[PDB]
Amino acid sequence: NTLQPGCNQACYDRAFPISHIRYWVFQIIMVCTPSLCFITYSVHQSA
Amino acid sequence: NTLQPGCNQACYDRAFPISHIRYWVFQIIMVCTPSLCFITYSVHQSA
DSSP, X not given: OOOOTTHHHHHXXXXXXXXXXXXXXXXXXXXXXXXXXXXXXXXXXOO | OOOOTTHHHXXXXXXXXXXXXXXXXXXXXXXXXXXXXXXXXXXXXXX
């Protein structure tokens, strides 16, 4: 509720510094990373 | 600086409850009133 140009962008950025979806995607990939490490180690071990 | 309807009216009313021009006109007429009273009394006294 304002007429100031650029206030919407600043207020949105302050309210939601990181979108929930981005954080959840990052979390999912990170938690899956150890499994990928294990699979790569298993593949490298065989031949 | 707002998008709220009716904020301009309320804020102008609060900032300037009475316009300067209206106050000055009222002051001028009131200060001239005693002279009008004297002139009317003089006219009535004569016949």
